[PDB]
Amino acid sequence: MTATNKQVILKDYVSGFPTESDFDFTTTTVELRVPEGTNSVLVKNLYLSCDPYMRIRMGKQAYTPGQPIQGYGVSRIIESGHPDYKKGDLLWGIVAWEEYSVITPMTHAHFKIQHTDVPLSYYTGLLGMPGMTAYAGFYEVCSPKEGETVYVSAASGAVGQLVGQLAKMMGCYVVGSAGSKEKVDLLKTKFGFDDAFNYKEESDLTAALKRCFPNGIDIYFENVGGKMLDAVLVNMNMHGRIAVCGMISQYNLENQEGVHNLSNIIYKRNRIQGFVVSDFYDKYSKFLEFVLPHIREGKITYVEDVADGLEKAPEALVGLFHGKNVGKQVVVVARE
Amino acid sequence: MTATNKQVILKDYVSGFPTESDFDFTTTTVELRVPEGTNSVLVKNLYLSCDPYMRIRMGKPDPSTAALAQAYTPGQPIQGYGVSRIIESGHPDYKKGDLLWGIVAWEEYSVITPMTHAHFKIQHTDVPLSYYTGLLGMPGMTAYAGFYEVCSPKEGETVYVSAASGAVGQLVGQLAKMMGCYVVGSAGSKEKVDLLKTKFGFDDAFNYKEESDLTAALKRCFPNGIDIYFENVGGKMLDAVLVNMNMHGRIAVCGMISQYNLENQEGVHNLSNIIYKRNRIQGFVVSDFYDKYSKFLEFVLPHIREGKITYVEDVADGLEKAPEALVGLFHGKNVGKQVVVVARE
Ligand SMILES: NC(=O)c1ccc[n+]([C@@H]2O[C@H](COP(=O)([O-])OP(=O)(O)OC[C@H]3O[C@@H](n4cnc5c(N)ncnc54)[C@H](OP(=O)(O)O)[C@@H]3O)[C@@H](O)[C@H]2O)c1
Ligand SMILES: NC(=O)c1ccc[n+]([C@@H]2O[C@H](COP(=O)([O-])OP(=O)(O)OC[C@H]3O[C@@H](n4cnc5c(N)ncnc54)[C@H](OP(=O)(O)O)[C@@H]3O)[C@@H](O)[C@H]2O)c1
Ligand SMILES: CCCCC[C@@H](O)/C=C/C=O
Ligand SMILES: CCCCC[C@@H](O)/C=C/C=O
């Protein structure tokens, strides 16, 4: 075939919060050939991830103006110049926001799917690059014992909803926070945490956390920052671990919020350790063969926001920095 | 037999900086009796220390601070670390001539109870007794504990040490030079920086005071960035270090002395940097590691006696000066460790 390839470019660099008018749709024409240099695969992009690191990549290796925005996503091989991928099987990894991409598959960037007995939308999230951040970030970096109390921020979403599920499986008391009432209702209905609150309904964030924890916070999984780290630093305990995954409060800000209560690290004998998921990708098969017995069984679940089409995909990345995503924000580019 | 026992009392709680005025003086009568309490010894305090925790045992009851603190009671005297000779006992491990270092009150004579990770015996006299406040005591143990067990160091790695000519800081940077390491310091005066470059053998050093852009100072000093940080300061300083740090690089949070004296506690912005740099900010109290005080003393006393560790001290005479001495530590007119002699020998 010689099909028309619909692409989402970034026009120019973003300074603050993203708008849909920082990105434009352009078209190329892909010849469905055995591809551009005999080391490569040609894929058809099935599902795409709208995940929040993309804002830090939108700043002045960083993205280049007039070219597609790179992201993770699930893809079907249409043709190959690589040895261990034939035509008709599945990968996940860094693809361009296209309908059809030619990529070179390097090991801990791009991964083959062997288990299609679960949704292939989950391989942008749960069994993808959000879910590995929750395995890796809770079991190494947070270093947990049972009974110990876990706090998850942006609990609602991607990374956050597996951290909490893995904790009320270990024997921990887990509290989450989220933006709207419907996002906060899932934490107790579906994912079945012990408590939850709406941080947007809290005028009282330090007092909110003193309410939820009569016994304090041993573990924190930091996805948010600033004002929430200040509050958590007060409500902590003796040898209290903080796992700094993200800072979504800060990405979208030029002159970014200051943390005041870092003196409660000497006193309260705290470890704040920052990680990157990429480092733990050697433990992906170890993760898959732990969590697929549990997803297949209904111990571990997932909520996804579905955004059908490449058309509503500027719409969908913009939407994270406000939290329109009721769970993990997937784009469907192709259904079959 | 009676003693005329002078004391240093605290008036009421501190907000902001201490002054010589937030402290007061009394005299008591102490009987030199063979004391019935339980496992209690009547000591005679010889030397005392001016240590900066004493500020967040001087402020109002807060739950955070109350992990190392108990908070000082507004009437009855200031507690702290210092050396002490036993002038009659009610213990097994201690008798009528033995010396102790530990947490005594700021008086001439005290009835204390020895506890294992509080009060420690001296069964080594070859070295100064004033040193069991600092080097052979609690500042030197912090330096051993927090550099070898929290900064998790390997040879050749680049170390930045803050409040570097004070008690804990000067030892860190020698313990670091005693491995492969590249040690740069920071201190207040010119007299202080000329002890880092010469006496305590640091590779380079500066005056944070005489530096306008602090990142520019640390990008001059380390071209290839910081691997280990011994954090004795906070604020401005911790922000500069986070942009000057290497990947999988560690930070040991000993103290944060810039903050203690502030009501409105200063913000560290770029703690964002620890994701993309895989960095570890780790806090400790020394209290947790006093089980390795035997394994400390078996190490350092071979290195002082051979001339591989160097140390300065700032002695002031009598309890009279012990207000003036704890105050001027927050400004920094202590050169090394601030000792207060109550009685010598
Ligand atoms: N270090 C790593 O290894 C690694 C890897 C991948 C991703 N990440 C990062 O970690 C986070 C992970 O995904 P996720 O689980 O958070 O999924 P998500 O729910 O899809 O992400 C968006 C969430 O951020 C919250 N939010 C947005 N603006 C905010 C603001 N201004 N202040 C406070 N909260 C705000 C919203 O939740 P509420 O209002 O609902 O609470 C919203 O649901 C991101 O920051 C991401 O960049 C880190
Ligand atoms: N268990 C523990 O973790 C533990 C135990 C002992 C001590 N500590 C802590 O570690 C720190 C110092 O240890 P040390 O034994 O070396 O004490 P020290 O001998 O009292 O050192 C005093 C230093 O304070 C500095 N200073 C004062 N105000 C300052 C300010 N506003 N900004 C920056 N620096 C300032 C001075 O330097 P300048 O001349 O440069 O101004 C001076 O050299 C304290 O924060 C203390 O509480 C912690
Ligand atoms: C090339 C895409 C970058 C992938 C690393 C990402 O997981 C890091 C998230 C940090 O916030
Ligand atoms: C009971 C006295 C407290 C002793 C702990 C002290 O070394 C901590 C210093 C923190 O800045």
Swiss-Prot record, chain B:
Disulfide bonds, paired cysteine numbers: none
Record text on activity regulation: Inhibited by N-ethylmaleimide and p-chloromercuribenzoic acid.
Alphabetized Pfam families for the sequence: ADH_N_2 (PF16884), ADH_zinc_N (PF00107)
Annotated binding of substrate, by residue: 53, 260
Record keyword Membrane present: no
Cellular compartments per GO CC: cytosol; nucleoplasm; nucleus; plastid
Gene3D superfamilies: Medium-chain alcohol dehydrogenases, catalytic domain (3.90.180.10), NAD(P)-binding Rossmann-like Domain (3.40.50.720)
Induction / repression: Up-regulated upon treatment with paraquat, t-butylhydroperoxide, diamide, and menadione.
Subcellular location, principal: cytoplasm
Protein name per Swiss-Prot or TrEMBL: NADPH-dependent oxidoreductase 2-alkenal reductase
Alphabetical list of SMART domains matching this protein: PKS_ER
Species for this entry: Arabidopsis thaliana (Mouse-ear cress)
Record-linked InterPro entries: ADH-like_C, ADH_N_2, GroES-like_sf, MDR_fam, NAD(P)-bd_dom_sf, PKS_ER
Family of this protein: Belongs to the NADP-dependent oxidoreductase L4BD family.
Any one biological process term the GO annotation gives: response to oxidative stress
EC top class, as a word: oxidoreductase
Tissue: Expressed in leaves.
Residues that, per the record, bind NADP(+): 52-53, 163-169, 188, 192, 208, 232, 254, 260, 284-286, 330, 334-336
Subcellular location: Cytoplasm; Nucleus, Nucleoplasm
